[PDB]
């Protein structure tokens, strides 16, 4: 038993949102079996939208009543969900699950899909150099960052390389935050102070792999010594 979701990755506010829950291996003929939709905004808990039983029996949440519609098609074996009056605060990942009886609820879960509701467009990410202004305190090591801004949807992987195209193990990944209709994220890397006062390499390259452009700006080290 497995479930797969599908739908648009970007929808404008105050529009129509449609999602399809693709399942195969069972039929909604026996009693007790049902399909439900659960969403979870980032940093929040699960939210119950609606649930539909057999014999075309559907239930809706009073907090969201007269705003959602549940339709099923036995021919294609997939439930169709329609969402109207899209709001930016309603952005979340939608999951569907199968209930195998009356007591075993949501035994099998799918994978879900991120549905971002932003008035803006999927523009290319913008990088900005970061110069360390630390002074009078070298401390253990020095750090340099990279500010990836104005990206949508949030799917970015960070990799750090030296001037000679080396490999760096940073693993410092900060989650994105919705600010002014756009997602913003920051990434840093820790480098030893000895290397700064040594090799002639005075800068490193910041690389981001986003499906809107393959730009890669370089962040120059401030050098303290």
């Amino acid at each position: 038993v497995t479930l797969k979701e599908s739908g648009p990755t970007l929808v404008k506010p105050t529009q129509t949102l449609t999602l399809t829950c693709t399942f195969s291996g069972f039929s909604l003929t026996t009693t007790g079996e049902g399909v439900g939709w659960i969403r979870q905004p980032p940093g929040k808990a699960l939210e119950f939208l609606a649930f539909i039983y057999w014999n075309d029996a559907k239930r809706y949440n009073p907090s969201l009543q007269s705003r959602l519609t549940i339709t099923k098609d036995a021919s294609k074996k997939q439930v169709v969900l329609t969402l109207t009056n899209l709001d930016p605060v309603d952005t979340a990942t939608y999951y569907c699950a199968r209930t195998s009886g009356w007591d075993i609820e949501f035994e099998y879960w799918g994978q879900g899909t991120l549905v971002t509701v932003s008035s803006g467009s999927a523009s290319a990410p913008t990088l900005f150099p970061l110069v360390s202004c630390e002074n009078s305190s070298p401390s253990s090591t020095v750090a340099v960052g990279c500010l990836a801004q104005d990206f949508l949807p949030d799917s970015i992987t960070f990799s750090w390389k030296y001037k000679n195209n080396s490999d760096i193990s940073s693993t410092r990944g900060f989650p994105s935050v919705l600010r002014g209709g756009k997602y913003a994220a920051t990434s840093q890397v820790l480098l030893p102070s000895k290397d700064v006062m040594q090799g002639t390499d005075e800068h490193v390259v910041c690389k981001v792999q986003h499906p809107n452009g393959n730009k890669e700006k370089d962040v120059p080290l401030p050098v303290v010594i």
Partner: protein, 97 residues
């Protein structure tokens, strides 16, 4: 970025083996390389470099071991300082000569 000052000290006229001290002061950044020369020939042993100390300015001192006979033989000793791609050479000899 300021060029380091190169100074070489000599043993006293009326006698003291001895040592040669080459001092570079008021230089930036901290890394600096100091070597010694003997009659235009590279020195492979007999010299040591002290750790760089903070006097922002830094100070570096180097010590070269020499013998009385070699110093009185009018041999030319040169302190080589490399800093920011620039090389400074200072030549000294016997004052009473």
């Amino acid at each position: 970025e300021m060029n380091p000052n190169v100074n070489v000290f000599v043993p006293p006229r009326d006698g003291f083996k001895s040592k040669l001290i080459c001092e570079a002061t008021n230089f930036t950044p901290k890394p600096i390389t100091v070597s010694w020369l003997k009659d235009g020939k590279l020195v492979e042993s007999g010299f040591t470099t002290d750790p760089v100390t903070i006097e922002q300015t830094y100070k570096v001192i180097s010590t070269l071991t020499i013998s009385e006979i070699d110093w009185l033989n009018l041999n030319v000793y040169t302190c080589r300082v490399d800093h920011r791609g620039l090389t400074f050479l200072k030549n000294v000899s016997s004052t009473c000569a």
